[PDB]
Write a protein that binds this ligand. Structure first.
Ligand code: FLN
Length: 113
């Protein structure tokens, strides 16, 4: 079926901005982890365990959350292993939203001003 992932990426904003994430039409009961998961290695991405707020799907099958995009964050995988400190000063960051396994909406990139 066609889900309804409506998120608000930080385009043209500075660091410390609150990214709005609202995913509807998901699996009610599943916990979705969302963070500023950006590129950390070749084909490898990593989320931030510092300012993260995993949201569980409600009885409507929707999950709304908000994350704070930092300039530098600790990159962590979905398994629990870290990859290193990611820094988006000269590079651009992005938002990552997926379940404990790694399924969900497509990633959206963000850019500072
Ligand atoms: O920590 C990780 C975060 C993300 C990710 C999920 C959705 C959108 C962008 C990035 O993907 C991975 C893929 C493999 C291993 C770790 C990760």
């Amino acid at each position: 079926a066609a889900p309804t992932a409506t998120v608000t990426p930080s385009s043209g904003l500075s660091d410390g901005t609150v990214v709005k994430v609202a995913g509807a039409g998901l699996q009610a009961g599943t916990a979705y982890d969302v963070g500023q998961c950006a590129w950390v290695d070749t084909g490898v991405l990593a989320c931030n365990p510092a300012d993260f707020s995993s949201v569980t799907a409600d009885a409507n099958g929707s999950a709304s959350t908000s994350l704070t995009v930092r300039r530098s964050f600790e990159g962590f995988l979905f398994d629990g292993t870290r990859w290193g400190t990611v820094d988006c000063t000269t590079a651009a960051c992005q938002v990552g939203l997926s379940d404990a396994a790694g399924n969900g909406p497509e990633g959206v990139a963000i850019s500072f001003n």
